[PDB]
Design a protein around this nucleic acid. Structure first.
Length: 67
RNA sequence: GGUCAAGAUGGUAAGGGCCCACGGUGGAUGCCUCGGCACCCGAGCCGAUGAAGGACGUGGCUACCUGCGAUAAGCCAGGGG
């Protein structure tokens, strides 16, 4: 989903902020999932981490670029 | 064929010794390397933009060895394939 890469690029302020916050939370969800479905979940976890990692890398890009 | 007397040698292993037989432990060692050694060209400074160097981490399932450090079996862009 380098496409997600794009959406990332797109957002920015309290935007990217709240977006990453929520998503991270979703990953919490995952963590709890640690003992349920799990099977197709694997990705959701590794990746999800990765993706929020993206969000982050971005905020750095964005506001650091700013100041 | 039966009795006595006289004379000389006999096989009998508990275990043991020497020789061969087939194994057992013990690794020589013959050969064999992703390991050293010696030289010679290259190369030659890192550090608070908190270094060298370690502590505690994460890899869904992971004690350890690796790599990352909480954005942690790593996210970004560019050069390779």
């Amino acid at each position: 989903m380098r496409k997600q890469l794009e959406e990332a690029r797109k957002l920015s302020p309290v935007e990217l902020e709240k977006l990453v916050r929520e998503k991270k939370r979703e990953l919490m969800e995952l963590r709890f999932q640690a003992s349920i479905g799990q099977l197709s979940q694997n990705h959701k976890i590794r990746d999800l981490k990765r993706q929020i990692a993206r969000l982050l890398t971005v905020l750095n890009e964005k506001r650091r670029q700013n100041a």
